[PDB]
Structures are given as structure tokens and as C-alpha cells.
Amino acid sequence: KEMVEANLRLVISIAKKYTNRGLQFLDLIQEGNIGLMKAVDKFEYRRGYKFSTYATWWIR
């Protein structure tokens, strides 16, 4: 929960690009939060040492 709350503002930058496509802003933010919470479960010390590099794919 702490890790998903620390990177909560990262999804707002990705959700801003997708707009006026049939979904409101809050719904897109909630979907991005779902994706981020689903991506935080699997994160090891792989080639990508930044959590954002692995979370952006799941959020998108």
C-alpha cells in the first residue's frame, strides 16, 4: 500500500494523454490505479531498476 501510494501521481501523467475517447478523467485515473496496483506485485531487481519503467507498461 505504501509503494502504490508513493507512485500514485505517476498514473496521472499517463492518463492525461488519453482523453476525450469516451471515458471520463476519474474513470481513467481509477483504471490506471488498478493497473499500477496489479503491476506492483511483480517487481524484482531486473535490468529496469526504476519502478516507473515497469509500471508505465502496465498503466498504459
Added chain:
DNA sequence: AAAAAAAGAGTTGACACCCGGGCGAATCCCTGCTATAATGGGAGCTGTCACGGATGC
């Protein structure tokens, strides 16, 4: 003065067929997985009053 049959019924086999139910095969929907660094948002009035009511000290 008499007396039997084309229809009218009644069937009996003989196809023609027409969707139904399976056997296939070919092909749709779902779901998840991608590893360099991405880190707070874009309209909208604002050129009608007037009434009738709801908060505040």
C-alpha cells in the same frame, strides 16, 4: 317389368424432399505479458430580472 358401373371411398406401396441434428473445420474473444528514464488538469460563464426563499453573527 329388371341389373351392373364412372365416380366416391379407401387404401397400398413408391418416391421427392426438407429442415434437424451431428461431425467437422475454421475461426472469434479473453487474458496476460512487454523491463533505459518518464511523476498534479482544461473549458465555462461574466449582455434578463424578480421572486422566493435558505444560511450566517
